[PDB]
Amino acid sequence: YIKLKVIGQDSSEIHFKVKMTTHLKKLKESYCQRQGVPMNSLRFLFEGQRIADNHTPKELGMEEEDVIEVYQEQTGG
């Protein structure tokens, strides 16, 4: 399992453990469901770049204890 560091702006320690086979597609909606918000309302920023729905945990370079940010979009979902 790959445990990513999901530190919220409010200083919250969220441990999101994913796998290598899993698609980042479901990862995005799962986070939305966890926060109780519509899909595409939040944008994930990794090394400045935004995570796409067709992205994979294999590309870019994601490891254990990897720090990633997520902020609210302007679209509203």
Binding site: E13, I14, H15, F16, K17, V18, T22, L27
Partner: peptide, 12 residues
């Protein structure tokens, strides 16, 4: 404090 643990299972 705040600790959140979520496990997701996704397969190709």
């Amino acid at each position: 404090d705040t600790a959140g643990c979520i496990v997701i299972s996704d397969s190709e």
